[PDB]
Amino acid sequence: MEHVAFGSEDIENTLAKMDDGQLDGLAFGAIQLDGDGNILQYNAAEGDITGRDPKQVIGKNFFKDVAPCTDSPEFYGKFKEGVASGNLNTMFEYTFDYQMTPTKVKVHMKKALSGDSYWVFVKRV
Ligand SMILES: *C(=O)/C=C/c1ccc(O)cc1
């Protein structure tokens, strides 16, 4: 397991340019989205929480396709505001309930260092 904690202050530096294998070593779920919400990376810990197959979701749109319960002001709306400002950094709890047992989580969405890239980190609460 990579020795990185959820919520750490420089998480975007520690995870910068991590390949898929390295991302699979985190204690928490990690998704990388483009500015439209298309899925670029999705780790094993996230697939274990949500049931999704980390290989199959790459290229799908998170808000339109995979996670319609996040297509709301409280998740997608916050994401797109942070994308626009270039300073996305928000941590909030949320419930995931599309075609799954409702699962309450803490979400941390933060701009990635790579261009047109945004992290969504997830752990259970
Ligand atoms: C609501 O539809 C949430 C769905 C969901 C959240 C996070 C994921 O990694 C996958 C699906």
Curated annotation (Swiss-Prot):
Positions where S-(4-hydroxycinnamyl)cysteine occurs in the chain: C69
Keywords of the record: Chromophore, Photoreceptor protein, Receptor, Sensory transduction
Any one Gene Ontology molecular-function term assigned to this protein's record: photoreceptor activity
InterPro entries, A to Z: PAS, PAS-like_dom_sf, PAS_fold, PYP
UniProt-listed Pfam families: PAS (PF00989)
Family indicated by similarity: Belongs to the photoactive yellow protein family.
Subunit structure: Monomer.
Name listed for the protein in its UniProt record: Photoactive yellow protein
Organism: Halorhodospira halophila
Gene assigned in the entry: pyp
